[PDB]
Symmetry: D2
Subunit: 466 residues, 4 copies
Amino acid sequence: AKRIVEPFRIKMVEKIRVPSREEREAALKEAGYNPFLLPSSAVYIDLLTDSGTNAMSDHQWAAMITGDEAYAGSRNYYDLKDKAKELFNYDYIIPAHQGRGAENILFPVLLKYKQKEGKAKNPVFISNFHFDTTAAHVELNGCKAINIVTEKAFDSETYDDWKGDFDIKKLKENIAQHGADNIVAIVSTVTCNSAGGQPVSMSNLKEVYEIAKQHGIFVVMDSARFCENAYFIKARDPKYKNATIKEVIFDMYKYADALTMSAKKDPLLNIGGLVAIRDNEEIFTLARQRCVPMEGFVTYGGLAGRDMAAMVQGLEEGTEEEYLHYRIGQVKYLGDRLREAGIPIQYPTGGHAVFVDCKKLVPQIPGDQFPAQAVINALYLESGVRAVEIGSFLLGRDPATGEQKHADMEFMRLTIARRVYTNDHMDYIADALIGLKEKFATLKGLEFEYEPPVLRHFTARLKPIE
Amino acid sequence: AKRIVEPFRIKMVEKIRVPSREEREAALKEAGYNPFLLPSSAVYIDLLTDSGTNAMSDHQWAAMITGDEAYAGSRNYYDLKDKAKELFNYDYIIPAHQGRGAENILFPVLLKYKQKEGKAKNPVFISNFHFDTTAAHVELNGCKAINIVTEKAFDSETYDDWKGDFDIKKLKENIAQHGADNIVAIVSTVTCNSAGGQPVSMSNLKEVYEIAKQHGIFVVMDSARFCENAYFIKARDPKYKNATIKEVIFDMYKYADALTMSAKKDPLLNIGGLVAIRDNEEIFTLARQRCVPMEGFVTYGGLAGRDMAAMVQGLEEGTEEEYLHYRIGQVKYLGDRLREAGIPIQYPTGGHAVFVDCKKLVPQIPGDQFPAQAVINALYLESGVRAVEIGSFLLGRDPATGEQKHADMEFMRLTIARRVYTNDHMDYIADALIGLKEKFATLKGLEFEYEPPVLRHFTARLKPIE
Amino acid sequence: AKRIVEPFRIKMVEKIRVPSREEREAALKEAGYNPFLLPSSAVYIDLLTDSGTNAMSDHQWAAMITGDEAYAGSRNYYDLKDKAKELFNYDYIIPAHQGRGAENILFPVLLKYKQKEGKAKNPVFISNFHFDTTAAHVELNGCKAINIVTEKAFDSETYDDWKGDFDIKKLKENIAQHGADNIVAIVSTVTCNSAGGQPVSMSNLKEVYEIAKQHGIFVVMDSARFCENAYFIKARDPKYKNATIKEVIFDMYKYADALTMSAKKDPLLNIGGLVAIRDNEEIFTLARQRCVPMEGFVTYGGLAGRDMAAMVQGLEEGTEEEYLHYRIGQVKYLGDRLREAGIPIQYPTGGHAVFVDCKKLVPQIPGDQFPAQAVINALYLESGVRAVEIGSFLLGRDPATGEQKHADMEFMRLTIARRVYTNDHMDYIADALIGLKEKFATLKGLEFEYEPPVLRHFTARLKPIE
Amino acid sequence: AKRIVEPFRIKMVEKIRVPSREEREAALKEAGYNPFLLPSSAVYIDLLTDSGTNAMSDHQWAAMITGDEAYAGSRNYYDLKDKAKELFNYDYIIPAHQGRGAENILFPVLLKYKQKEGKAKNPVFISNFHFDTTAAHVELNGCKAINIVTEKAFDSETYDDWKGDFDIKKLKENIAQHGADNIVAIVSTVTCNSAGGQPVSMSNLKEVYEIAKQHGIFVVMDSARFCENAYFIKARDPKYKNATIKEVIFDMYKYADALTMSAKKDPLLNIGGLVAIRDNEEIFTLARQRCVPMEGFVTYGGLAGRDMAAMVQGLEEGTEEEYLHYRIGQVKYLGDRLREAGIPIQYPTGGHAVFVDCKKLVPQIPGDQFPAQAVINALYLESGVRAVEIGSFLLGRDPATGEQKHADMEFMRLTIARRVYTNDHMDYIADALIGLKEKFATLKGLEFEYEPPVLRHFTARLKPI
Ligand SMILES: CCSCC/C(=N\C=C1\C(COP(=O)(O)O)=CNC(C)=C1O)C(=O)O
Ligand SMILES: CCSCC/C(=N\C=C1\C(COP(=O)(O)O)=CNC(C)=C1O)C(=O)O
Ligand SMILES: CCSCC[C@H](/N=C/c1c(COP(=O)(O)O)cnc(C)c1O)C(=O)O
Ligand SMILES: CCSCC[C@H](/N=C/c1c(COP(=O)(O)O)cnc(C)c1O)C(=O)O
Ligand SMILES: [K+]
Ligand SMILES: [K+]
Ligand SMILES: [K+]
Ligand SMILES: [K+]
């Protein structure tokens, strides 16, 4: 395990504290054994998500101070539009308040556009792996979300360079089955969050886009972690060994038609989202027509002007290779600490989190009883670290049948905010989970007390089994 | 006209600039003669809206600096929930990114809830006046938006205390014609933005609420400008002559079942919304379930934690009587400057804006040629001040008819951001408008060029008559 | 009077409060009838000083955020050094924590440098008027502080373009009387604070410098309000009618060898000072050697790095003609209000304050009973406005025999912080003071309870003389 | 060597970068081989000082935003006055722009007050050790600055609990030789910076104070690093084993009559200083009379209001035991990395810095050829880290003679700002210096090329010899 020093020093700190065991126990049962329902005051180190918890730089706070709060035509909107042209070569932007705001703007528009000629009678979206809000927006619009990640992602301890890849064979199988007239869009998620933050190769992106263009299928790049994906391409694709990160990104986005981005991840924000379209002006116009009632006027999209200003600056800092090297290396450092102690993880670690394989850690719990959630709850009670489940709990049920969706992966996700915790916090996380080696065998699954019908895991309340 | 001293001093400034006449003429042509498409760099004083353009206090910025950016369970969420319980006596909150996000959370939930009871077969919403985004959500969900503002609102020059009131007789008539089963909700807009930011009396709110409870009709207070409404109730209802603003607010919210609020208005924010529900926990659960995919997790609703921090402080400052006296008095000052010179305005002035009655100012232009917009563009080229139309352009077209909705009013809205401009800025605005006295008789309408089917006035491009 | 509109808008506000008459009564009594000892919570509008109370721009706060806090070699030190070179064409800078820090750095260095030839045996400084701290550092170093402003400044009500000018005849007469070898330095105070903020013409500065170079005398420019002086030169000198402010400043500093500066005035700051030296490297070295033990290392001089950063931006904004026109026009507006009601003031008003001639306002109180303080207290008890005395109380005792220094002017200074108050605040001050006209004749003087030996007007406690 | 985790997380970052070797060479040549003259742009990790470079907390920045900028009577002045009453039990405060401003306010007052009785005809100040500016202000007012730190501070590698203590025998011996009438003040420096940030025990402070009240001698507590001293008292004195930091602080200040403080240290600021006085109103009145011409009005003292508000918050945060345990533990960690690799240091490490004994690292470099500055220069060229010298380059020239290289200690001070650098930055520093064991044999001394007659270290020039 190699500690990689920070390419920055600390400018402002925020106090954290360890609540007592009795605090955690009470807090956990008040939360219905769902850490999502814990107040942050009951949490020590928060690894629930890497979304919106990032530490910004002094340059980003300075851009916020001068942000233009105008309702129409803010200076920062044109800065953002120029930045998107520079980074992605895309000519149209619509800001959004966050990632799922951007999907709410763009996915219904693509559905209605697909349906112009009486097509898309049984519409589907295809992705390497739709994430929760992305899949929810697909199914909310009467569509069907189809995930075709390479099965190399299901073998956690076996190394592979691109565990986020599409399965090209499955892609052509699904185009054959559903027909090109039913494929509303192909969504390229970079990195692929559900597979463990794993990168997608340039040739995979290129091949998917080529196949999509042969059949006239629109391609949207889900871009929340595009910079981490770009680093992995440079690190592992020998054709880009000597390319800058911005060069890698520029090429990535030749293989999509639009992007939806949660700017709360790689652009180092606490809020903010973005739709960008390469050249299709009709889609842009219709998406502006939906942005207005749903998010806000087209030049702020539900963002304060200061947040668009932070986004312009963050979109630069997120691409800096020295920062990416440290950030991705801190995640690798945590994973190696765990792997060197026998804890099974998705190998190699992704860009933003360590995914602990709980199928192997607590095999006496079936997936329908949420084995990873039992490990998470145990970790919290022994240390105050809050982590999140990426398995059967999160996958939800099938909108057609109503039964549990088959989860090929039961992960506890140790999600790392950008520039927030040190390697010594990592050591704390590792040692607390490593110290649980004995308790794992005697952990009990969990049963629903209250299940919402869409995105259940966010607000569900659970009870142990026996 | 009377000038009221600020109950505060200036702590931070932002430069503004007057663009040369040539720049304003180029900019407007580029903007398709729709000032919504003008960049703020081409606007001197911006009166397009009082939403999100407010100046915050130093306590609000200090609150943002210590805002808890936790994804789930931010301590600012809990402070917000205590503040709603203090101000409104409501027990449930869901933050939203702004007002139209709050509406998207609550309104489809109220429709769907009524439909599951076998009701809302031909669903309508009834309001004193739905504002544009509010009515757009009503229509998007398949319902009709009915406005029943008191007829005194159309009598522009004639003073009345409560021009935002419901017409009780039309309330009963519509309940009779559509049936209580089809009324999805009554929306009490306070102040009534579309009537000229004019107040709704306490006795009107109370009688409306009593009528609704008789029929089992849910009542929603659209609370964007609730503090401005509360001040007017104190200024004009002798029953509250010696009450605090908070006591007036506490009584107002006895007469709704929930509220949707744009926190970008009276809470003095640049971004932010809120849903609060008095005590119906079922609606709260359903709205929480719709929040998660649309806005964000239920303890931040698409806001950064700093923005929830600003909101808690802003709701306290928004209610301070000496501030409101200054704020509403600045609006009155602007209105009095114009009324002195013979410009017909909605009288008395509302809380947030002067409404210049363009039916009486420029009678030669037909209602279907948007007379108020002709005045707006003329004001912009003359002074670099940007205003907004509240007439036929805004009303758009009638659903199911594709026809211009009947516009009882043609208004140019001089919208005043909170704590941003001085009374000397007000004199500039007034002087520029007065100077066009002789050119009012020689103005013409405009023709559509690109008309959006919903909320057309935002991105529509226009062209002069000749 | 004429109100000039702000060339900016408000971005952040700070609440102020009017304390009751009963509070003012108790507060002034506890403060030893000396408003310097009032807590700010007892003041509504604070006209005590324009020093360090200014409102900064968003750009200045953005600069503070990215300030370099390094102990040696802060990035902002080199920006400040380039700024001084651009504005003044001076090659050396030493930052200081404020104006009197700069004086404590430079004046002792100028004295010992003058002594190095066996000279300065009876040392004096000559100025148009030494400000209080300036004169105190002169006297504390064993030297005499000579003031020789134009007698036009004693003709309060009579207009003159240049009431801050040196009396040239007195300059030459003091040189002949004292000998050039005794004049440690000539201090050109621009604007002349003690005369009423009144400007020094460019030809007056040029002639003073030429006389000083004729005699080998070092010339320091006390530059706290150099930007207000530069404006007045462009307004009133036909040679500079079409120059830029920066061009005027560039020429002003041709007529000095160094400057001391409180950046708490015209650079729009809350803290900060500066020494800059044109090209005498020996003085620079000796001043650097004094800086280290008194102020701090020579690249921050007792300033945080953010404050140096704010100083670089402020030095630019303070020279903007549009801001200067408004700022100086705001002071003129308050003066004309008082001048129109028959209140005698120093006319024309200067850059930063209105000086009310209390010698004429309350002719019944002798100067040793400090008549201006009588007015000040009355204005405070009536309105919560706090002003300051610029008369015999401020002038103090002579260093020999403790005799009261004969004051030629007994002023009440209404000092206006930059970009902080509106013209409606100005209206409040004027109406308060205008409303006291029936009570001026029935006012008494004051006598000492505790007199500090140096700068008594700051901590002295007074008792009314009845 | 034990890494202690942060009791906080990062809210805001500032970017740094390692200048290429050529830039470091160019920078050092242009800086005249004096790192005090390097632009920070040429510096990676700055160890020049722990003064004014600290990272503030979000509560401190929020305090700054609501700061009351009023010239007289700022709300934050009254908050600061109530804070000093709470922490120290002292009744009077005067804010100051930084520590040496506080010294300029109070020390000349103390001499004048002692003179007005007919005493202090041959005036001296006595300290466990006067810091540099402190001693400079003493000597600028015609007095002699006497240092009488325990002799255990001179045995660099031998552990002692309290290497900052007063030598009590020398204290009594100096009171006997100079006379109580000539001792203007006793200055207790906590922690004792010039000894290596080494703590003073409570019983030592108490005994110094007792001897001084017998002889009528005023006692000033130089409090730049009083929190670190309180932590060490709690760590090493069993009587305070179960006391809180604030109780230890409350007890320390029973043994002084006044304090001067650089708030740029333990109160976690970038600027700021403070004078506080226990109960002597006359000394307070005289100090105010000096504050007004030197610093500013008595309710802001040359500080912006935002900085007084920060100081009120930082005074609270600087006493937090979990923070102090982390902060002092990180310095200990750096020292242990070096000590475990054979690098001689002042042991145990102080509260704010590791001090490296360079005479043992560069033997064939004598004192007048700047042995500690040679290591520092080599270290910067090799790593871009800037450290400071506490040896014969700082010591300067004998009066009317030559190099006062009577360097009792030839130290390189690796000074650690609070809450700024991680333990992985600590590793970089240690690995860089440890990596210099090979090139130590180059033994390249340093020779002047330009020199000032006074304050040479702050701005001199030299060349390798
Ligand atoms: C053509 C004017 S532009 C639109 C912004 C604005 N009004 C917003 C309101 C909203 C929506 O809230 P938001 O999503 O936060 O904008 C709900 N209810 C009411 C009464 C409002 O006034 C205004 O300027 O009048
Ligand atoms: C009633 C409060 S007097 C203190 C502020 C004050 N002027 C200060 C001046 C200084 C010293 O500068 P600082 O140490 O930064 O205060 C030097 N020269 C000149 C012309 C000045 O005016 C004022 O209010 O006029
Ligand atoms: C606490 C766990 S759920 C918080 C969501 C967060 N991911 C968000 C996300 C979005 C929506 O972006 P946004 O609407 O801004 O959240 C879209 N696409 C992808 C690939 C994403 O990963 C995450 O993985 O932790
Ligand atoms: C390279 C050394 S530069 C000096 C700055 C710093 N120490 C300052 C200090 C002061 C002056 O305080 P201030 O005037 O605020 O600096 C007073 N007393 C003590 C015990 C101090 O340690 C330090 O040790 O680096
Ligand atoms: K957040
Ligand atoms: K905004
Ligand atoms: K100030
Ligand atoms: K600093």
